């Protein structure tokens, strides 16, 4: 009903042209660079395993090829999204070539969009990390990006890593007493689990991501 777009990985002339077009068709453009969960649609020049793309997937947004906005321009209104989804057979047929990484990111975006939007049609909005209550233990340079990615998918990020937080926590991610968290029914996992959870067709085996101090639990 109200279309709200962000743009990623586009050239400058494209960005200007598409912002103009979106506004002309009655959409809103979020011009700020970080992912904003207010958006409904993201148009990306190529999939990347970065925070903005993974956050769009974790939130189940429409992740669309630029040919979507060319179809809108021709129609003079926002058209049906499905055939312009990055993971769609229609787009994968449209491309001359795609690397396995980009194909996997494209299929992940479509898989999560279908799941999250099917539930939305039934009156529940939940992201890929719904029910996660997370302790982060990462390098300061990485903390804010992990927090933004987890919150985009619906996770609650707990304030710090003190022992009282282990009771409510579901997950602790490390790049603090790990064995005590593990003893309090916290999955204590390497940070690779987050991208791999979004990307893998079936949920990753936690055993492959379990931090050393937690292997017993």
């Amino acid at each position: 009903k109200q279309y709200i777009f962000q743009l990623s990985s586009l050239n400058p002339q494209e960005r200007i042209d598409y912002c103009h077009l979106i506004e002309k068709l009655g959409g809103l453009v979020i011009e700020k660079q970080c992912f904003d969960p207010t958006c409904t649609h993201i148009v990306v020049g190529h999939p990347l395993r970065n925070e903005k793309y993974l956050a769009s997937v974790a939130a189940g947004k429409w992740v669309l090829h630029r040919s979507y906005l060319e179809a809108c321009r021709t129609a003079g209104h926002f058209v049906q999204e499905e055939d312009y989804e990055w993971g769609s057979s229609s787009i994968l047929d449209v491309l001359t070539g795609i690397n396995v990484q980009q194909r996997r990111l494209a299929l992940a975006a479509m898989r999560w969009r279908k799941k999250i939007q099917q539930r939305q049609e039934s009156g529940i909005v939940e992201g890929a990390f719904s029910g996660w209550k997370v302790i982060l233990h990462v390098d300061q340079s990485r903390e804010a990006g992990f927090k933004r990615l987890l919150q985009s998918g619906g996770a609650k990020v707990l304030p710090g890593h003190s022992v009282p937080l282990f009771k409510e926590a579901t997950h602790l991610f490390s790049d603090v007493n790990i064995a005590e968290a593990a003893a309090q029914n916290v999955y204590c996992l390497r940070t690779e689990y987050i991208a791999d959870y979004l990307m893998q067709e079936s949920p990753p085996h936690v055993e492959n991501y379990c931090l050393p101090e937690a292997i017993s639990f």
Binding site: Q33, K52, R142, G145, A195, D196, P204
Partner: peptide
């Protein structure tokens, strides 16, 4: 956030 800087950061994978 440092969105422009952090945008470069590729999240780790066991793949």
């Amino acid at each position: 956030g440092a969105c422009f800087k952090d945008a470069e950061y590729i999240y780790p994978s066991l793949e």
